[PDB]
Ligand binder design. Structure first.
Ligand code: O76
Ligand code: O76
Ligand code: CO
Ligand code: CO
Lengths: 382, 382
C-alpha cells in the first residue's frame, strides 16, 4: 500500500555531503576506492575563502567532500559578502560536527520541484529548520532541515531543465575517468536511539510513507517518497541481546544519532566488487568477512531460479549476499567502516526484477540475510 | 666547518607523525600515492581507546598518522591507566592542532641514545618542554620538546639493539608490499616568521651546527647533527618582493609557523617519479608544473659530466630539477600541497657524490634552482 502522501514534489537523491577535516585526502581515497571521477570543485582556486569542496561522480551518484579553511581567510566577510559556494556552511558547525562524530555524512540531499516551498511546507509540518532557502545566482535554490542527529535533509531545486553555482568543472588532466559500475544512490540509512519518534518526526514533515518489508540487534522501518525512489531507512538498537547491538555500538562511537550506511546501486555488481576488491589493500575499501560456503550451497534452493550455478559461484568468489522478497531479488555486500570509527560504512547493491524501468526497493533491503547468515554459520560449524 | 657540538648523541630520523582528523583515509591515500606499506597499528582493535594510529613504511622512512577517538571512549581513564600507546597524545591538543593548521606534521622524531638525557640536556639548554620522558614497557623511552609553532621534536631511545610498545604488526592480507623506491627521510623543513630567533632557540638546545650552503622570497639556514644525517632547514619570508613570498602564504594559511616540507630520499628517483606520476590522478599526489625545455637544454652545460644525455632526457620526461654544489649533484622535485591548504608538501630527492656510505647533504638543497628556474623561464619566453 502506497498512499502517495508526499507534502511536496520530490524527484531523486541528488548528492551526499561528507564533512571532513581534510577534503582532499578523503576525496582522493574515495575516488580510487569506489571508482568515482573528480568532476567539480569549489575552493581557493575558485575564489572560495571559506571551505574546500570536491565533488566525485559515478553515473548519477554524487559524493561531495567539504572541509573548512582557517576562519582568518574570510574574517572580513559577512553572509551578504560570503565567498562560500554553499551558504549553509559554517566553520563552527563543521568543526563541531567532525570533532563530535569524525568523518561522516552531514547532508542527504534530494532534488525537489521548489526548495523554498519544500522548506516552508516541511517547517509548517514540524521540521526543525537548519538553513533557510537561499537562491544561488538566480539559478538554484537550496534549503536544509534537520533529519536526525546532526544530519540534515537538503532540498535542491533548479530553474533549468553545473553542480552548484560557483563550482567549477574539473580539468580533464586532473579528472581520470574511473568507473567500476556504480550508478546511483539507492538508499541512505540512519541510526537513532528511538525509532518511533524519529519516524513520526520525518514522516510528519515530508509525508513519506512506510515502505513494506517482506533478534538481530535492531528494529527498523523505511520511509519512501511517492514513487519510492527516495528511500530512507531508520534503525534503533535492541538492548539486552546476547551479542551487543551494532546500532548501539554506532551510537556510542558516533556520539549519538547519524547516518549509518549508504547503499550504492551498481549496474554490474560483479564488476564493481572485482574492481573494489583489487584495490582494498592499496588505498581502497575493505569488505566484511565473507559468509561460509554453506551460505552459498543454500543459495541453490533460495534463488536457483534467478541465478545460474556460475552466477552463484561468482557470488561466492566475491562474498556477495543474496536476498529475495515476493517481488524481486537483491544482491548486496557491505564494506568495513569508511574511516577510523566503527560508524559509517557503504553497501553495494544490485536489484533484479520489478520491471514496468525498475520500481524502487525491488527485493527489499536484505533483512532475510540476518537469519540466513546465522543459519549458514551454524550449519558450517557442523 | 663542522664543530660537532651536539649536546647529546643523535642517531637518525626515526619517524614523522601527522595529526589527522581521520587517520584511516589519510594513511590509505599516502600509502597508494607514495608506495608505502602498512606495517603497524594502534587503535580500537589493539585496545587503544584514545587514538587511532597507523604506520606506513618504505625502507627506513616511517610515516605515522594519528587521529583522536571520541573522548567518551576513554572518559574513565587517567594517565596512569591510559590505553593510549603514545602517552604524549592529548585529545584537546590534537583537535586544536588540526582545527588551527589542518593536516600537517605534529612530530619530527629522531632516535637518540637516551631520550631522558636528551630531554633534560635540551631543557637545561633552553628547550621548551612539551612531554616529559616516559618509559614504555621498560623498552622504549619517548620525550618531546617544542621545535617551532605547534611542531615538536620527539626523542626516542631503545634499550634493544616493534615500532613502539602497544603497536601491532599489520597482517599480511592488509599489508600490500608497495614500493616505489623511497628509502629514508633526508631533511625536514620548517617555516617561521623570524629565522634568527628560531635558529638561536633550536641550535641552543641541541648543539646542532649550521650546515654550509654553496630575492626568491625567503632566507634560510640548515641545522645539522654531528654526522650531518639529521638536517633541519628553517625558512623565514622576505617581504616587499614583486611576487608574494610563498613562506608568507604558508604562515597565513597554516595560522603560523609549522613544518613546510619533507624531503624523501629515493634509491632511484626516476622509478619513484614514474610510479608516483602514474597515480597522480587516481588517488596519489600531484607535482608542481614542470620547468620549460630551456631548463633541460641548460642542463648539458651544468651537469653534462654527471648525467648522460638520456639520463637528462629522463629528467625532462619527469619534470626533475637538478642542482650541484662543490661536492655533489642533487636531483629533486616537489609535490603540490598534500592536503586542502597551500602549506605542507613533499620533495623527492636523490643525491650523487660524496662517497666515503654517502655523507649528509651531498649536493646541498637546490638553492641554485631558484635562479636557474627564473633564468630558464625568461629564456623560454624568448
Ligand atoms: C552478523 C552477520 O552479518 C549480518 O547478519 C548482517 N546482515 C545485514 C542485512 C541487510 C542490511 C541492510 O542494508 C538493511 C537492513 N535493513 N535495511 C533497511 C537495510 O538497508 C545490513 C546493514 C546487514 C548488516 O549490517 N549485518 C551485519 C554485519 C556485521 C556486524 C553486524 C551486522
Ligand atoms: C618559483 C619556481 O620554483 C622555484 O623556483 C622553487 N625552487 C626550490 C629549490 C629548492 C627547494 C628546497 O627543497 C630547499 C631550499 N632550501 N632548502 C634548505 C631546501 O630544503 C624548494 C622548496 C624550492 C621551491 O619551493 N620553489 C618554488 C615552487 C613553487 C612556488 C614557489 C617556490
Ligand atoms: Co541497506
Ligand atoms: Co628541500
Amino acid at each position: 500500500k502506497n498512499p502517495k502522501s508526499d507534502k511536496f514534489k520530490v524527484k531523486r537523491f541528488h548528492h551526499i555531503e561528507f564533512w571532513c577535516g581534510d577534503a582532499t585526502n578523503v576525496a582522493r581515497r574515495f575516488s580510487w576506492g569506489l571508482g568515482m571521477r573528480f568532476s567539480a570543485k569549489s575552493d581557493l582556486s575558485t575564489g572560495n575563502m571559506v571551505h574546500a569542496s570536491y565533488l566525485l561522480t559515478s553515473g548519477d551518484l554524487r559524493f561531495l567532500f567539504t572541509a573548512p579553511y582557517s576562519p582568518s581567510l574570510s574574517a572580513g566577510e559577512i553572509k551578504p559578502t560570503t565567498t562560500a559556494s554553499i551558504p549553509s556552511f559554517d566553520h563552527g558547525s563543521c568543526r563541531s560536527f567532525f570533532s563530535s562524530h569524525g568523518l561522516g555524512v552531514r547532508a542527504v540531499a534530494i532534488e525537489v520541484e521548489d526548495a523554498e516551498s519544500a522548506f516552508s511546507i516541511s517547517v509548517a509540518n514540524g521540521a526543525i529548520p537548519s538553513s533557510p532557502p537561499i537562491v544561488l545566482n538566480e539559478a538554484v535554490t537550496i534549503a536544509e532541515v534537520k533529519l536526525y542527529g546532526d544530519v540534515v535533509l537538503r532540498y535542491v531545486s533548479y530553474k533549468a531543465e553545473e553542480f552548484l553555482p560557483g563550482f567549477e568543472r574539473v580539468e580533464d588532466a586532473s579528472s581520470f575517468p574511473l568507473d567500476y559500475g556504480i550508478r546511483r544512490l539507492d538508499h541512505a540509512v540512519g541510526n537513532v536511539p528511538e525509532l518511533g519518534p524519529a519516524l513520526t518526526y520525518v514522516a510528519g514533515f515530508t509525508g513519506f510513507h512506510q515502505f513494506a518489508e517482506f533478534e538481530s540487534g535492531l528494529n527498523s522501518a523505511v520511509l519512501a517518497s511517492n514513487d519510492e525512489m527516495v528511500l530512507l531507512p531508520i534503525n534503533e538498537p535492541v538492548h539486552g541481546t546476547k551479542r551487543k547491538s551494532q546500532i548501539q555500538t554506532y551510537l556510542e562511537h558516533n556520539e549519538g544519532a547519524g547516518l549509518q550506511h549508504l547503499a550504492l546501486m551498481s549496474e554490474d555488481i560483479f564488476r564493481t566488487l572485482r574492481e573494489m576488491r583489487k584495490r582494498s589493500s592499496i588505498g581502497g575499501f575493505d569488505f566484511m568477512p565473507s559468509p561460509p560456503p554453506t551460505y552459498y550451497q543454500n543459495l541453490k534452493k533460495r534463488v536457483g531460479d534467478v541465478l545460474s550455478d556460475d552466477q552463484i559461484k561468482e557470488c561466492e568468489e566475491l562474498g556477495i549476499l543474496v536476498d529475495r522478497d515476493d517481488q524481486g531479488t537483491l544482491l548486496q555486500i557491505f564494506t568495513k567502516p569508511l574511516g577510523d570509527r566503527p560508524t559509517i560504512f557503504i553497501e553495494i547493491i544490485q536489484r533484479v526484477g520489478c520491471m514496468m524501468y525498475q520500481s524502487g526497493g525491488c527485493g527489499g533491503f536484505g533483512k532475510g540475510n540476518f537469519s540466513e547468515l546465522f543459519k549458514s554459520i551454524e550449519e558450517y560449524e557442523k
